[PDB]
Amino acid sequence: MGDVSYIVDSLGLPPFSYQMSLLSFTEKGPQELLQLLSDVFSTIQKVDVAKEVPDQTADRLIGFLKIIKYRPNVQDPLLFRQLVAAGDRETLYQILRWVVPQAQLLEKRAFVGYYLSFPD
């Protein structure tokens, strides 16, 4: 905190426009958070994380992060992996804090050429 308030404020804007309380957020454990990251990425195919094993969850989100050019704080690729898989609070807050603001920009760029009426 208040990485938290930054993240929460960003979720109340587009493309999420969802009101989450400072408390409700911090009450989220490892799996709710991996879901949240997963759902954030889907807003920008959605996935119920309880239908995945945490090792391909990690890789899948790591794959997406490399796409958008995320520089993790942890410089050990495999320690980052496992921290993602374990849903570490600080690691996840770190990612969410970087990604969620600028989601409107990430979405605009992701949305491009998808729809026939809106060519690349």
UniProtKB/Swiss-Prot annotation:
Top-level taxon of the source organism: Eukaryota
Annotated region (CH (calponin-homology)-like region), positions in chain: 1-118
Locations listed in the record: Cell projection, Cilium
Domain notes: The CH (calponin-homology)-like region shows high similarity to a CH (calponin-homology) domain and mediates binding to the globular domain of tubulin.
Subunit structure comment from the entry: Component of the IFT complex B, the core composed of IFT25, IFT27, IFT46, IFT52, IFT74, IFT81 and IFT88 as well as associated subunits IFT20, IFT57, IFT80 and IFT172. Interacts with IFT81; the interaction is direct: within the IFT complex B, IFT74 and IFT81 mediate the transport of tubulin within the cilium. Interacts with tubulin; interaction is direct.
Similarity remark: Belongs to the IFT81 family.
Function: Component of the intraflagellar transport (IFT) complex B: together with IFT74, forms a tubulin-binding module that specifically mediates transport of tubulin within the cilium. Binds tubulin via its CH (calponin-homology)-like region. Required for ciliogenesis.
Name listed for the protein in its UniProt record: Intraflagellar transport protein 81
Top-level taxonomy: Eukaryota, Viridiplantae, Chlorophyta, core chlorophytes, Chlorophyceae
Residues of the whole record sequence present: 1 to 124 of 683
